[PDB]
Amino acid sequence: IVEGSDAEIGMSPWQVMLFRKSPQELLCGASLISDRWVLTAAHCLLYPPWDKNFTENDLLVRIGKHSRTRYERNIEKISMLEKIYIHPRYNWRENLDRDIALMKLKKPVAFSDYIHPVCLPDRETAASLLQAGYKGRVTGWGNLKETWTANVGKGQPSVLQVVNLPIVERPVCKDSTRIRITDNMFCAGYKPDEGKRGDACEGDSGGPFVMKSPFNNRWYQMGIVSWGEGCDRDGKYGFYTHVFRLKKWIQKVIDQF
């Protein structure tokens, strides 16, 4: 997260860390949607142009975390994966279309003050909340700047970061990039003339873009951090997987499995 700030403890209890076993490194964000299912971006796990193809045994999922690096003995739960499911029509060749994946935990996690699932939206929520100019929230442990001076600058955050960003009109999204955008994506960020900044960055991918409904007080996952071009560039916007448009696939996978 570029130009965000420190999360409060428990502010995002559905935030999941994808953790590589060997070498030990932060892979990506994810989110908790029930006691045994985790939602993330497909490109976190599978991207053949860079020979990236992670397996159930390559990864741990860490839930309830605040610190990026500490083993938070009293608070976090570490789980292994039973099975990974990638959208069958996930398009890694040209635009990261349908950038979505589900992961089933080997055992259920116990909820607590620090571990709690986010809601997926229904039709009415999606139609009310997904409108240009409205703001959602992005969280993660990814980089604080696109680039920095080696061994001097920082870098990676020490605790979870948070930034609030407005949804941007579809035509402005389209004009900002040569990449072919589909209806399975939306874009968010400030416009160059607005004098605020903020973006997701490396390591934030797969994490949740969430919105709060004023009428029932619940948080909904509307997007997944998918892609962009650098971090926090002027006249550039982050792109997000459209969770609602892909809800039917989620429903199939959870029901069948």
Binding site: S5, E8, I9, G10, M11, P13, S34, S112, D113, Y114, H116, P117, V118, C119, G133, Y134, K135, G136, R137, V162, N164, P166, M211, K212, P214, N217, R218, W219, Y220
Partner: peptide
């Protein structure tokens, strides 16, 4: 019924609000 979701034990459930959520809600009414 439907499993509880999107209500945070340390915030909504204790009627506390986080430092910046007010910014999100205000965006709905401009």
């Amino acid at each position: 019924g439907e499993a509880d979701c999107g209500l945070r034990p340390l915030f909504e459930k204790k009627s506390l609000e986080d430092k910046t959520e007010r910014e999100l809600l205000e965006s709905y009414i401009d």
